[PDB]
Swiss-Prot record, chain A:
Protein name in UniProt: ATP-citrate synthase
Keywords from the UniProt entry: Acetylation, ATP-binding, Cytoplasm, Isopeptide bond, Lipid biosynthesis, Lipid metabolism, Magnesium, Metal-binding, Nucleotide-binding, Phosphoprotein, Transferase, Ubl conjugation
Described purpose of this protein according to its UniProt entry: Catalyzes the cleavage of citrate into oxaloacetate and acetyl-CoA, the latter serving as common substrate in multiple biochemical reactions in protein, carbohydrate and lipid metabolism.
UniProt keyword Disulfide bond, yes or no: no
This enzyme's EC code(s): 2.3.3.8
GO molecular function: ATP binding; ATP citrate synthase activity; metal ion binding
Residue location of crosslink Glycyl lysine isopeptide (Lys-Gly) (interchain with G-Cter in ubiquitin): 478, 484, 492
Residues recorded as bearing Phosphothreonine in the entry: 577
Chain sites annotated for binding CoA: 712-722
InterPro entries: ATP-citrate_synthase (IPR014608), Cit_synth/succinyl-CoA_lig_AS (IPR017440), Citrate-bd (IPR032263), Citrate_synth-like_sm_a-sub (IPR016143), Citrate_synth_N (IPR056749), Citrate_synthase (IPR002020), Citrate_synthase_sf (IPR036969), Citrt_syn/SCS-alpha_CS (IPR033847)
Residues annotated with Phosphotyrosine modification: 130, 620
Sites where the protein binds citrate: 308, 345, 347, 363, 378
Amino acid sequence: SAKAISEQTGKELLYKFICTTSAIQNRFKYARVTPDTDWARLLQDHPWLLSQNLVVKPDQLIKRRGKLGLVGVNLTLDGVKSWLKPRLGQEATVGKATGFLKNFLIEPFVPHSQAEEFYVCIYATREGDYVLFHHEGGVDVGDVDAKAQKLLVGVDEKLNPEDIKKHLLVHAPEDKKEILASFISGLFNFYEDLYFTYLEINPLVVTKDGVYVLDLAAKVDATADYICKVKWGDIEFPPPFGREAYPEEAYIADLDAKSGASLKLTLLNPKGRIWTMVAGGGASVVYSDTICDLGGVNELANYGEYSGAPSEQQTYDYAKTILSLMTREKHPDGKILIIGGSIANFTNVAATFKGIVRAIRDYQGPLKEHEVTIFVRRGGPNYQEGLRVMGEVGKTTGIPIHVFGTETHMTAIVGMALGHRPIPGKSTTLFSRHTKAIVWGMQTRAVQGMLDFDYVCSRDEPSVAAMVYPFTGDHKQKFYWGHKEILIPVFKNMADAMRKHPEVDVLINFASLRSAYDSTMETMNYAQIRTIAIIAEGIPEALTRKLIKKADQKGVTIIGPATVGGIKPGCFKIGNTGGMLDNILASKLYRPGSVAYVSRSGGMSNELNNIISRTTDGVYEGVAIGGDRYPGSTFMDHVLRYQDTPGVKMIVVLGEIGGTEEYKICRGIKEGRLTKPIVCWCIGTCATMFSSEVQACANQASETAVAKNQALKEAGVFVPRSFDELGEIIQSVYEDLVANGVIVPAQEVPPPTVPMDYSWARELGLIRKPASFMTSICDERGQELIYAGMPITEVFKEEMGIGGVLGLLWFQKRLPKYSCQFIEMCLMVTADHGPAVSGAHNTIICARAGKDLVSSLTSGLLTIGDRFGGALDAAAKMFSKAFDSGIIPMEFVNKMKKEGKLIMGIGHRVKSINNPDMRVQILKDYVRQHFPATPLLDYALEVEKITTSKKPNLILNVAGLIGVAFVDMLRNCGSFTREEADEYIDIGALNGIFVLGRSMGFIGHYLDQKRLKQGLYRHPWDDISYVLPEHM
Amino acid sequence: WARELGLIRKPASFMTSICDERGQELIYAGMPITEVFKEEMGIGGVLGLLWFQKRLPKYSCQFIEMCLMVTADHGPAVSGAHNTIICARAGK
Ligand SMILES: CC(C)(COP(=O)(O)OP(=O)(O)OC[C@H]1O[C@@H](n2cnc3c(N)ncnc32)[C@H](O)[C@@H]1OP(=O)(O)O)[C@@H](O)C(=O)NCCC(=O)NCCS
């Protein structure tokens, strides 16, 4: 939307980005003075104010400050000091609002008269830009709209100087006419390039010295920041002149910019009783109007809404913030919290309500003593399961939770809250049963919903003909016809999709705000598409106007941006309109009706669908034009389209603050263009009973909801007194029409079945599917990596080395430090043993064959087994089986000798006693020094004594030492049961130790062969004995 | 049960085109194994069905088989034969 900016920001933008032939003075010549800043620094870094006269103004968004006495003229430096004292720092009320003053601006003075002051204005409208010039400027203009010279500029064209001369600048002297003609053109160029929507200079001084701007009011489009963020620097949006934003209120605005969700909150008086946290913008407006209509004008405290499919954290923060701001007061009468909302279509009801459960779970102490009663009502995707979660959680906590579902009226909770009710070239047709649609984007949900509509409406032709996703090639995607297989075709470019079926008539775009404009513009180039529905919210207003004008000249109807779309029961739906499957079944939207409605909000359109379904034989078609200020189609367009449809019998109009569209509807009714019975209601009637409204932008009393409702009521429109009676009046008109006989209610036909998504079926807990895999070593699903129950940050904090991580991953145990260090030593010892062994040889051969690291390492590793690399495991098993039996080492040696088995882990080629193996010596020294008990190592050393008595070189090997010491570690460290250690030896933990250790050496060998640039190896023929058969 | 009643959608994560074993008949690329054997499509024909999903002409299948035979082995001195021999002598 459009937001007003400060005077200084507008002035600096004008100075930096102006392009005109006029002489520009006061360029970067201004100073911002603040109550809480160093004055000495201000006159030190910027002393250029010491030369000429100074003018001081307040820069807190003050309108018509000239007559208020806040404008100081002819001030000296000491004069400025004396002038700022009596008003700066405290309250200075204006009109009906109250607020302080903590920001002022000072500029140089120029001597001039009223004849040199002129009024310049530009403001953006649906048809382009209206520019106003007034020669008798200053603060004497008064009424301006019907007095100043007005010129219209169409969308997407330049402003020629001669039009300014002979149609805009008529009452000025020629000498200054020549300069103003170019100055206004440059001003318009600056306005258009920076994406401003409202620019105001009053007054403007022009003289032989140059052009001076005394006061400037600027309203710019925030949504177009991505077009001018580099050209805006650090732009700020000052709040309207009033009470400063609360520290918790601005937190909601901070959440607003986290994602595409809408998160707004405003405060008037925190001392009130009624508090609302209603989901959805339009739903929140309706709820506020309902509460203020029946006696909540002043007792309401907050005004907040949340929509746009907020996530878990966003809704959690919103709820905790609103409750925290709720618990700063004690109300003896009592406290209530109305949270309602319309029927949601895209917002995840379950996630948001789980978030507010988590937010209310810990906010129970500082709320129970404040006697807070919560009234909950909602509908949408996964509403009932979360609703019963609310029921059970509210029963568990104890606070009064009043749960109302879809079956109850939207505003009934408000009625029971205060005790008022006891507590219980366009075309007349756009979509048809044969309509084909192209969905642009990675939006599978839209296609699924449209296709499910095609089934529940008993259509023999899918409404979705193509999918366009530029970042993937032409392919086919899984879907069902009935319950059998179909494939939707997904294309890269729009041209191919348009050509492959030219009968497609409607396109619905789900592209983000960056590419929505370009995609829509390129879609406009094909005459097959007759209706384009834009779903993105946040498109710049100028680009939206360009799209609207191009569609109007192309004859293509538009569903305006910032909406969920529309639904035609029995024929067609746009995007996520109508909600999920069971809501379509409940709202009875799978058969055509006789009454049609038009609105702006998305979810509240589904609420109107529900109201009509409850009180009328069904809906024929409903369209939401969007929340942007310039929707592609207005209310009047859809009203005429419904009027030209014979199937439609009643018209419903449900808008809000903004525009004079209802006056146009009344005018069309009076002169005989509209004849069908019409029920209309303008929400926002409470906007006059609040302090200031932000979520629109009414200018006069004519654009007020109450005035529009009255003008509709006494013009031939069935307007109820409020939204509460809207259902009753609609039902009464339906009864009158069926009593007349124009409407013949057809009998119901049962809808067919359509399959349900597995993921959201699994979320509801409706399906059991057994897990095919079981893991226990690592968890990566959470926000932190987990190693056997131990977080990675805790792994590194505890200084668990490679051995500690190995223990966690292989044994799921927190091993003692000496165990981890012994594991690392074992890895170091087995790291490599030269290139001559089988595994190193195979790795070297594969590396010299040009293969990558993985293939060479793998080729080497696959030799590890019984003859190579299996000595650790064999030695451990042999010594463990000997020691577990009662046999003494001598008996073990004799028993091995009898069976013709060499004791695995004994015997070295060159090392003997009085010539120790150094690797064995290091490992054995560490094991003796640090291990608590080494029974198997003692047994193996006795066996070594015997075998060395037999023959000197029969010493305990590296393999035997590592095996027996690893058995001792697993068995006598206190982390394993004896059965656990036995199982870990049995399943091959020592094979893993050897393989992981020798992988280092094998990778080193691969890197060495690559670095040495060794060529392909072929074994010599003379080293091979060829003994082949002679004839066989 | 839900899949049998056809009220649950879960997309398949794998796609295949060469062999179907679910049915009463083993099928190589849309051809039953009985028809594979009764039409004398040997190693080459099965290879064409499984690798290219085509019924190659008879001479193509025989040429594929001849290519397999000529590359069957080239002595123990080459790298792959050397590694296979060494891994075999390691008891694997
Ligand atoms: C194919 C190509 C490698 C020919 O190689 P070459 O250098 O002519 O000969 P080789 O590499 O076979 O070996 C040369 C000698 O080593 C001998 N030799 C080959 N393998 C041996 C082994 N395992 N032990 C001992 N000697 C061997 C050969 O008998 C030959 O002996 P000679 O010098 O007495 O004739 C060469 O032309 C080329 O690079 N061509 C590119 C096309 C290609 O790469 N084709 C792949 C081959 S199917």
